[PDB]
Amino acid sequence: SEDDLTKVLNYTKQRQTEPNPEYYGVAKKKNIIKIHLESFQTFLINKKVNGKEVTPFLNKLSSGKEQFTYFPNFFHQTGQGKTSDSEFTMDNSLYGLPQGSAFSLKGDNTYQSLPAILDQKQGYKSDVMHGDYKTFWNRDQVYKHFGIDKFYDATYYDMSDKNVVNLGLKDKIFFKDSANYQAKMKSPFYSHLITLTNHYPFTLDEKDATIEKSNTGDATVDGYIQTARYLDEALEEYINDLKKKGLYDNSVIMIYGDHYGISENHNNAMEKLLGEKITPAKFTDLNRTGFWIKIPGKSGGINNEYAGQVDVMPTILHLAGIDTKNYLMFGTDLFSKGHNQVVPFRNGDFITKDYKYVNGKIYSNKNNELITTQPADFEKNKKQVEKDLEMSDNVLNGDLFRFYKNPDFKKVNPSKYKYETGPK
Ligand SMILES: O=P([O-])([O-])OC[C@@H](O)CO
Numbered sequence: 001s002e003d004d005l006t007k008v009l010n011y012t013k014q015r016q017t018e019p020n021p022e023y024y025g026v027a028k029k030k031n032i033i034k035i036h037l038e039s040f041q042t043f044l045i046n047k048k049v050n051g052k053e054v055t056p057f058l059n060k061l062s063s064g065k066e067q068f069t070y071f072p073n074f075f076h077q078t079g080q081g082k083t084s085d086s087e088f089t090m091d092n093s094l095y096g097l098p099q100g101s102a103f104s105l106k107g108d109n110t111y112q113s114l115p116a117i118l119d120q121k122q123g124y125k126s127d128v129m130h131g132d133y134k135t136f137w138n139r140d141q142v143y144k145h146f147g148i149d150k151f152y153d154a155t156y157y158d159m160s161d162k163n164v165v166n167l168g169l170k171d172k173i174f175f176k177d178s179a180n181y182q183a184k185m186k187s188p189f190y191s192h193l194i195t196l197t198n199h200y201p202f203t204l205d206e207k208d209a210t211i212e213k214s215n216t217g218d219a220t221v222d223g224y225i226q227t228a229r230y231l232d233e234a235l236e237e238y239i240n241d242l243k244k245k246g247l248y249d250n251s252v253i254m255i256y257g258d259h260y261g262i263s264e265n266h267n268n269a270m271e272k273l274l275g276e277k278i279t280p281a282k283f284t285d286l287n288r289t290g291f292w293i294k295i296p297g298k299s300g301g302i303n304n305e306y307a308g309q310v311d312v313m314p315t316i317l318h319l320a321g322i323d324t325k326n327y328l329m330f331g332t333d334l335f336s337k338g339h340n341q342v343v344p345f346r347n348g349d350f351i352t353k354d355y356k357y358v359n360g361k362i363y364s365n366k367n368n369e370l371i372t373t374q375p376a377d378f379e380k381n382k383k384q385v386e387k388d389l390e391m392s393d394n395v396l397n398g399d400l401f402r403f404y405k406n407p408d409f410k411k412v413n414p415s416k417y418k419y420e421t422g423p424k
C-alpha cells in the first residue's frame with residue numbers, strides 16, 4: 001500500500017515543469033478569488049440571440065483586452081459528480097471517479113489539497129461561499145479534509161421566496177452578499193464562489209430575464225440563454241463591487257465554467273442554435289468551459305494552449321511562488337513552456353492541439369474530419385490518458401495519501417474544521 005503510493009508518485013514525476021520566470025511567485029501572498037460559472041460553455045462567448053449578446057461582460061473579458069488572460073481551449077474533465085467533480089480536480093489536480101461522486105464516496109479520504117498547501121506555506125485562510133446548504137454533495141465533510149477554513153452556505157443568505165429560483169439563491173443576491181462577506185476577511189485569503197442560477201432546467205422568472213429565449217422549441221436550450229445572460233450580469237456587477245471594495249486590482253481572479261450544461265440529448269436544438277450538425281467530434285469541441293485569469297501586474301491576453309481543470313492547481317501554486325516537486329498532481333502549470341498539452345476526459349476520450357480522440361476514432365481539430373493515418377504521438381498520448389485516469393483512481397480507491405510522509409505537507413486534522421450555521 002505504501003508501494004501503491006510510491007508507484008503513483010514515481011508516475012507523476014516525468015511531466016513536472018519548471019515555472020515560467022515571468023510568472024513565478026508574482027502573486028505571492030496576494031488574495032485569490034475563484035469564481036465558478038455553473039454549467040457555463042464557451043459556445044456562448046460572442047454568441048447573439050435575436051441580435052442581443054447573451055454574455056456581454058464575459059465577451060469583453062474574452063477579448064484579452066480587459067486584464068484577464070482567456071483560454072478558449074480549456075476543458076472540464078468531470079463525470080457524474082458534476083460541480084463536485086470540478087471542485088475536486090480544481091483543488092487537487094486529481095480526477096473524479098469513473099462512476100459516482102468522489103465527494104460523496106471518498107469524503108473521509110486523506111488529501112493534500114490546494115487550500116491546505118496555501119495555508120501551510122503562506123498563511124492563506126480559505127473559504128467557499130454557496131447559496132445551497134452545506135451537506136449537499138457532502139461538502140461539509142469533504143472541505144474539512146481539504147482544509148477549507150470557512151463555508152458560507154445557504155444559512156448565510158436570505159432564502160426567502162423572492163430570493164430563490166430553481167435550486168436556491170439567485171446569483172445577483174449571492175454575489176452582492178458574498179462581496180460584502182469578502183470585504184470583511186483578513187488577507188491573504190483564498191475565496192471560492194460557487195453559483196447556482198445557470199443550472200438545469202434553466203428556469204428564470206420573467207421579471208429577472210433581460211434577454212428573450214431562443215426559439216429552438218427545446219425548453220432546456222431556450223431557457224439556458226436567459227440564465228446564462230443573468231449569470232453574466234450578476235458577474236459584471238460582482239466585479240464592479242470588487243473594484244468599489246478595493247478587492248480587484250491586487251487579487252488573482254480566476255473564472256471558469258464547471259462542466260457542460262447542454263448534453264447530447266439536445267443535439268437537434270443545438271444544431272438549430274449553432275447552425276451546424278452536432279457530431280461526436282463537435283460535441284467534444286463544445287465541452288470547452290473556459291478559464292479566465294487576472295494576475296496583478298500582468299497584462300491580459302488570449303492564450304490558445306489546450307488545457308484542463310487538472311492544470312489549475314499547479315498554475316496557482318507557481319503564481320504563489322511555491323515549489324511543487326513533492327505534490328502528487330496530474331496537471332502542469334499553464335504558463336510554463338513545458339505545459340503538457342494533452343487533456344484526458346473522464347470517459348477515455350482526449351484532445352490535444354492537433355487532434356481529438358472520441359469514441360475510438362481520431363479527428364483533426366482543423367475541421368473535425370476523420371484521420372486514418374495515426375499521428376506520430378498517438379499511442380504515447382493514448383497511453384498517458386489511460387494511465388492518468390487509472391493512477392488517479394488508485395489514489396482515491398486506495399486512499400493513498402495516508403501513506404505519504406511529504407516533506408512539503410503537514411497532515412490535515414479534519415476535526416479542526418467546523419462550519420457554523422449562519423445568522424440567516
Ligand atoms: O453538481 P451540480 O448539480 O451541477 O451543482 C449543484 C450544486 O452545486 C448545488 O449545490
Ligand SMILES: [Mn+2]
Nearest residue numbers: 039082083258
Ligand atoms: Mn455544476
